[PDB]
Design an enzyme around this catalytic site. Structure first.
Site, PDB file in Angstrom:
ATOM      1  N   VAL D  60      53.071 -30.853  62.597  1.00 55.38           N
ATOM      2  CA  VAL D  60      53.297 -32.293  62.646  1.00 55.38           C
ATOM      3  C   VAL D  60      52.010 -33.019  63.016  1.00 55.38           C
ATOM      4  O   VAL D  60      51.016 -32.391  63.395  1.00 55.38           O
ATOM      5  CB  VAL D  60      54.422 -32.647  63.637  1.00 55.38           C
ATOM      6  CG1 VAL D  60      55.716 -32.019  63.186  1.00 55.38           C
ATOM      7  CG2 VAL D  60      54.066 -32.191  65.047  1.00 55.38           C
ATOM      8  N   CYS D  61      52.031 -34.349  62.920  1.00 55.20           N
ATOM      9  CA  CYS D  61      50.799 -35.130  63.039  1.00 55.20           C
ATOM     10  C   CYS D  61      50.097 -34.917  64.376  1.00 55.20           C
ATOM     11  O   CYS D  61      48.885 -34.643  64.369  1.00 55.20           O
ATOM     12  CB  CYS D  61      51.133 -36.602  62.766  1.00 55.20           C
ATOM     13  SG  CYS D  61      49.785 -37.782  62.972  1.00 55.20           S
ATOM     14  N   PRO D  62      50.753 -35.018  65.529  1.00 52.61           N
ATOM     15  CA  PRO D  62      50.125 -34.554  66.783  1.00 52.61           C
ATOM     16  C   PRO D  62      49.849 -33.057  66.707  1.00 52.61           C
ATOM     17  O   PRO D  62      50.726 -32.286  66.307  1.00 52.61           O
ATOM     18  CB  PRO D  62      51.189 -34.888  67.841  1.00 52.61           C
ATOM     19  CG  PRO D  62      51.991 -35.987  67.245  1.00 52.61           C
ATOM     20  CD  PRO D  62      52.045 -35.676  65.775  1.00 52.61           C
ATOM     21  N   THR D  63      48.638 -32.606  67.110  1.00 52.79           N
ATOM     22  CA  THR D  63      47.543 -33.253  67.880  1.00 52.79           C
ATOM     23  C   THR D  63      47.913 -33.379  69.365  1.00 52.79           C
ATOM     24  O   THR D  63      47.042 -33.451  70.238  1.00 52.79           O
ATOM     25  CB  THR D  63      47.095 -34.629  67.359  1.00 52.79           C
ATOM     26  OG1 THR D  63      46.878 -34.566  65.947  1.00 52.79           O
ATOM     27  CG2 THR D  63      45.785 -35.033  68.037  1.00 52.79           C
TER      28      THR D  63
END
Lengths: 179, 170, 170, 179, 170, 179, 170, 179, 170, 179, 170
Positions: D60-63
């Site tokens: 997923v985007c996170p990081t």
């Protein structure tokens, strides 16, 4: 009618059995000298290797019997008691072991599950009313560590069973180290 | 909770699987190019050889691994399809086959039974919450002709099962 | 669990049997050439004489054995069919008849009640798990006209049963 | 099958977990050195911040992970124990944490809810059979003070969670004072 | 008593609401000119962002308030409708929005769940008898894609929810 | 869902209430200074005069409020405690009493029946989900001696209630003697 | 046992009543000329004002009595019908109105609920076995818009009820 | 709803009653001076002669009332207590006895069975909801020795009742000897 | 077990009875010439006056007996039929009326309720097993308008019942 | 509703009976001198000969009554008590025995089974509601040794009954020896 | 278990019987020539006189025996059929009648109630397992008009029963 798997307690049992070993050596003072009662409490501290087959008079490709007679030493060396089972009578076991030259020296006992109570309890009784070709390994705690079942008239591989037992008892990791 | 034995109908199933074959030999057109759905209806007329194990990423023996790959042809020649199963996700199958050199060329699919419904239906899900180390042979009628279950971490003998299949076919 | 008595309908049955007659006088075209299936519908119009015993390979008396073979003609002449039964397998019947000289020429079939369903239906299966030592006479209406049961290992009197059958027929 | 909300007691649990921290530093005398059992009684006096996700190997985007590794100090400073959970096996956790360079130093434990009993008890198991993306904050009395659940493949915002925790622990009134 | 989670159908509803927008910019033709009825069928094709709070007239943070008003355009541009909810009466919504300068320009409607039927249906009504501090995001299929619940008096982050919505829409 | 009549025991209750009296006089050291918990055991030896209305922000023809503030002395002189009730929150009561100049000095408490348990128990909750316009008089034995309920937006007549109370407490026979 | 409140349908009824109006101004053609049967269907479109009291022949206040008679016109003008009720017999109503000068000119009917079925249906019958001192206002839909109940022997305020009716009608 | 016959126990009762005798003679210090409570235990050792009628204000052909007032001495001479009963209120009894000149001196009490519990228990309550015209004689053991019930508006014959009582108390055999 | 009261339907009945009238004035053509069957349907339009007593052959007072015979005309003139009842047999009625001079001229029938079904249905059968000393008056609709029951051996007043009947008819 | 046979216990009973013997001889000081209560315990050590008939006023062909009066001595000589029973009242028995010259001296009692409880218990009550023509012999142990029942209006043969009793008491074998 | 009394329908029956009449006067064509089946339908229009006794071969009195044979004509003349019954077998009836001179000429049939179903249905089977010593008279409607039962070994009086039958017929 249920079949048992890894981790399950093997059923209790108490059955008439044809003794193992050379038939001509036991003194023939009475017929009952050829037979004994064997119970699930009979082999304390031992692993139990249980072989079911449908019917005495079996003629499958093994050949496994001579290997029983030579390998019983390996089983004993591994605190293992071999036990064979069918629903035929002890007289059928007797007949089978006395005149099939190969079976004359079968070194372990032959149990008669004539009430099918053990075949039933193990989940081994089939739709024809007989024990399927099944192998169990039971640890000294009476816990199943291996089960194998086969259809039809497929012969059993005992050397594979020795390897499985050894790996179970030694924590050997690889199928390749057994020799 | 019931374990199937010889003669029982093998359960129906529909599961995401990591494809068999040379894993590096695949187009990156979609992530899904590495994956497929597999059902009990997918290979009519074939025998099905099903291997359950508890968890991927556990040490497995290489000699047992080579065949499949040397013997996969022998299974195939007689209409036998190899199938692997754990409850781990298909991405775990992917990772195991992608990073461990032995698995790079695994020729058969790896099914992910993530809801554990098939492990349940076959009776192989154990008290630790995983599929037992189990082998099934299923005939073209979806009928079990052989089942094997093992405790602990005992390595499987693939050559024995080939022997059994051949003998079952005579 | 119920034992049939005179006047009861004898149970239906369908069992594998070792054939009667000179056992060495048979073609080895198939193992199954030595075996047949026998049903309650197989001999319309015949009386049926059914002998149950616990186990084959137990000592049986020769004088009791000769007749059947000398008297089998006398039973046959009046539409009476002899039938033997134990729960042992048909291969056990084969072995018993094949290796013991007295049984080599046994003129009637030996049925294998291996699931014990018939022993159950006749009420003859005992606490040891075997068919009691029992004789039945069944008339052409499938109706029992005589039943005999014995404990232990008492030898049977075939001449008495012939006497009874003849008297039943007058 | 029910989902828990504000004020509810967080479920009891006892699960195998992959230890937090640098994987290369623990002595490799046996595999079991990499794992421990963690219970709902494991962190007395601490708030518990519980993160569920469906599957290891998430991208997923996170990081957010680097922020875990830097922010664990903020959580500890706030008597807070971070706990991550999926239904994947501890070997999947191990695989994930060992070769994704970012995860090599994840400072908190990774629990394996392989029986789904905890995901089930929390109401987090979904129709695909896995834990939804859910965050819980549980106070030292085992009472949930915050829950957040997200569909699909939406990344979590950890800094928001720090603010929420701080406001819960300090009676700060405004979203604007956190810096 | 059940709390909805992602994937659940958001409940149907029909509630009196205080209108959004510049509150002073309205004709006094009827008291009801300040109020409307709002249903779950009212905006087909829109995402719905639902905010529950326990009680009006409690201190709320201004920075959280500005957006909505600066960001309301951003929600609107992507077919997202903001909705506020408490169990207080619509006249309480009116009073809160009429006397506190920050709320004078609130751009979205305030629903009055006075029977508490919706708070019940969403699972947000708590042991104090009020709606929990909860946020829902509902997709055009009436399906929940996000839910958030908070204890006590923690201020909400509207920018985070905008972030989440945008990411949900990609 | 049942409504109570003459002779019935008034329900037990325990509710947050906005204090009566001048709001500007209580020291503002914390918000909780404006509120208290009031129970059915709160006024021993007193008659209780209970007024239900649907919603705060009521604008009915009375005018009765100024009469509350002047007549509380008459009620006290008659060992009577006035109690007002709606289902609105104590913050709604607060809002109502603080900026409606007339209500700034309301001398008796404002109870919040937000769980509707008391409105329910008294039989006062209506199909719109709110308390009907109802008046009760309860004697020191907790027994209802008078109940009045009104539809719609009809104002209450408090002077009538004073007469009724006086007649109940004095055994005066005639409506005409009250002045 | 249930007491009706605002919004409830007032019970149906059919009772013998002593007529309203100047009591001495009536032909003695039959005893029944002083009596009538009254039903809930008798005045479509009228509001109904129902007064229950425990027992006739108890002291009642004259100022409360004058109106009705001065105010009966005011009730009538707006389609309101006054109705009195006790469980005493109609002959008791007759006697009370016939011998006490104040009641000689009572302008409305007095119903006798002798089986106490209506007192039961309205929920006004009390533990002493009598109708409570109760007032109801019923709108043209048979719907209660006002109810009042009093303990003991408190005199009723008719002017208040007129006030309430007028306000209910606006 | 059942009616009692010869040999049955008369019901227990406890009812407000208008006192017998000249109304103008009792001191009017309070209204309660005109009334008393009467129980089924009120007249030990006495026979009870119970008269039910539907409604006060009865105008049947007897005339029996003057005979009550003269014959109460005969009843007392015979250890007999007369008791009249209707479901009308004690104020209706009062109204009836005060202005019907004949009733001003009725020498025995008037019971108010306003709950109809006694009329019900005796089987005397009718389909119009009132007590039928019924007479009972009850012996000192509370056992009914005579009951008479009449339809409509038929007057009662008290002299017949005296004869019946006398015959019951004296074992006189003939209707003709009474004079 | 239930006793009928005013307004109840008198039971149906069908009983053997000794005829009324001059008993010596009858042809001896059959024993049955002295007897008849009487039903509840036998006299349409008549009032029925029913007297139950425990047992015949008990002392009964003559003055009470003369009327009936002097007053039987008065009952008859207004469509009233006298009926006597005990559970004794019809032959007992015959004997009582045949041997006691007072009864020789009894003008009405005597019914024998020997199974006690009617005494049961009227509720008059007592703990001694006999009909109570009871009088009923039944109107032409089979409806009871008067009932009287007496303990012990109290003589009945026929003149009183005539009085009551006349008053019931006005 | 069941009828009793050989070997059965005769029912218990307690009934008013008209005394046996010459009616004119008992002193007529009160009516109760003509009657007594008779119980199943009344004749200890005696056989009981019980005759049921439907109705007093019976005119059957016997003639048996004179034989009762002469044969009671034979019954007594045989420790036998004669008992007659119908459902008619004791006054009907009285009427029957007083003016039928033949019955004036009937030497044994006449029981009134007016509740039919004994006729019912013996199985003797018929569809017309009366006792059938039945004879019972009951031994000193209360056990029936003979029962005879007859339809219609058939007369009873008492001499046969004497023979039966004698044979029962003497173990005489032949019907021919009785004279 | 129930004993029939006067007015009850006598049970249906179908039993083997030893014939009445001169026993030596019969052809020996079959054993069955001495026996017949007898039913309740066999003699329409006849009265049936049924004698039960416990056991044949017990001493029975000759004077009681002669009549039947002298009086059998008197029974017959008025359409009355004598019937004897015990539970003993018909061969026992045969033996009793064949070897005891008194019974050689018995003119009526002897029925064998060997299953005891009729003794049961009549209520005559006793605690010793046998039919009581019982006589029944049954009219042409199959209705019992007389029943007699005796304990022990009391001899029966046939002349009395003839008397009773004649009187029943008048």
């Amino acid at each position: 009618m249920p079949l048992l798997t890894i981790g399950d307690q093997f059923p209790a049992y108490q059955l008439t059995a044809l003794i193992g070993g050379d038939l001509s050596k036991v003194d023939a003072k009475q017929p009952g000298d050829y037979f004994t009662t064997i119970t699930s409490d009979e082999h304390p501290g031992k692993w139990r290797v249980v072989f079911f087959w449908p019917k005495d008079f079996t003629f499958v490709c093994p050949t496994e019997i001579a290997d029983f007679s030579k390998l019983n030493d390996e089983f004993e060396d591994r605190d293992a008691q071999i036990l064979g089972v069918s629903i035929d009578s002890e007289f059928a076991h007797f007949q089978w072991r006395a005149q099939h030259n190969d079976l004359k020296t079968l070194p372990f006992p032959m149990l008669s599950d004539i009430k099918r109570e053990l075949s039933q309890a193990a989940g081994v009784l089939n739709a024809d009313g007989v024990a399927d070709r099944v192998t169990f390994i039971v640890d000294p705690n009476n816990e199943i560590q291996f089960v194998s079942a086969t259809a039809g008239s497929v012969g059993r591989n005992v050397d594979e069973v020795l390897r499985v037992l050894d790996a179970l008892q030694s924590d050997e990791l690889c199928a390749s180290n057994w020799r």
